[PDB]
């Protein structure tokens, strides 16, 4: 009962042809639903069912030892997907965020290449992230459903994500099959930079 599946900000076909509608529906109603269901099961009987998911995943070292794995995977899955839907919409940043991107990466085009590289070289399942770390932007990747908010010890990297892309094969296989780089190029067309900017201002 802790978490519910969030509604999408747009119809399943709103991100076409960049992301197919069938993928959106399955990704949402099956994959994301499963993380919600399994996180809920894991949270029953604990003192952690009342925390927002993004706070729970920052407290994985405090949960019961036998629940840590399940919560890392499933609360991570829920946090990651919840953000993912919101940072897309039906294309460049501006204002303070663009300035930060320019400073950290040289240019928006250079940032894109770095972000794409991190996504491409992530072997197996996982995510690539733009994070705010000590007030500065960086590009990182994580395995499976790990999130940089989980911290160094668990996720391998840290910082507050403001943008992420799902590079699990489920995110792209129906439309792109093996062609992850084509998926990643097409992703830039659906990023909601207004939402990413809101998250940057917040993280700063």
Q: Minimum distance between the CB of residue 95 and a copy of itself, rounded to whole angstroms?
A: 36
Candidates 4, 103, 177, 189: give the one binding a copy of itself (CB under 8 A). 177
Q: Does 170 bind a copy of itself (CB under 8 A)?
A: yes
Give residues with Cβ within 8 angstroms of 61, minimum separation 6: 68, 153, 154
Taking residues 68 to 107 in sequence order and writing x for each that binds a copy of itself by CB under 8 A, - otherwise, the string is: -----x----------------------------------
Report how far Cα 82 is from the mean position of its chain's Cα atoms: 8
Q: How far, in Å, CA of 126 to CA of 13, rounded?
A: 24
Minimum distance of a copy of itself from residue 41's CB (angstroms): 14
| Side-chain half-sphere exposure of 79, counting CA atoms within 13 A | 26
Chosen residue from 13, 34, 51, 86 binding a copy of itself by CB under 8 A: 34
Q: Is 78 annotated as a binding residue?
A: no
Q: What is the DSSP letter of 28?
A: I
41 part of the interface to a copy of itself, by CB under 8 A: no
End-to-end, the C-alpha distance of the chain in Å comes to 32
Q: Is position 113 an interface residue for a copy of itself (rule: CB under 8 A)? A: no
Q: Binding of a copy of itself at residue 30 (CB under 8 A)?
A: yes
Host H or E run for residue 175: helix 173-176
SS3 87: coil
Rg (CA), the chain: 16
125 contacts a copy of itself (rule: CB under 8 A)? yes
Shortest CB 60 distance to a copy of itself, Å: 15
* Smallest gap from residue 143 Cβ to a copy of itself (A): 7
CB atoms within 10 A of CB 169: 15
Site residues, a copy of itself (CB under 8 A): 26, 30-31, 34, 73, 123-126, 143-145, 168-170, 173-174, 177-178
């Amino acid at each position: 009962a802790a978490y519910t599946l969030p509604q999408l900000p747009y119809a399943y076909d709103a991100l076409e042809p960049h992301i197919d509608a069938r993928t959106m529906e399955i990704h949402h109603t099956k994959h994301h639903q499963t993380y919600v269901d399994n996180a809920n099961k894991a949270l029953e009987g604990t003192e952690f069912a009342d925390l927002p998911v993004e706070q729970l995943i920052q407290q994985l070292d405090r949960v019961p030892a036998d629940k840590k794995g399940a919560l890392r995977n499933n609360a991570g899955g829920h946090a990651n997907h919840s953000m993912f839907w919101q940072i897309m919409g039906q294309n460049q940043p501006s204002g303070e965020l663009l300035d930060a991107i320019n400073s950290a990466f040289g240019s928006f085009d250079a940032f894109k290449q770095k972000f794409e590289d991190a996504a491409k070289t992530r072997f197996g399942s996982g995510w690539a992230w733009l994070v705010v770390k000590d007030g500065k932007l960086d590009v990182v990747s994580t395995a499976n459903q790990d999130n940089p908010l989980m911290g160094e010890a668990i996720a391998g990297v840290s910082g507050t994500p403001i943008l992420g892309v799902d590079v699990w094969e489920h995110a792209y296989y129906l439309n792109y099959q093996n062609r992850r780089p084509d998926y990643l190029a097409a992703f830039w067309n659906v990023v909601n930079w207004d939402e990413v900017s809101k998250r940057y201002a917040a993280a700063k």
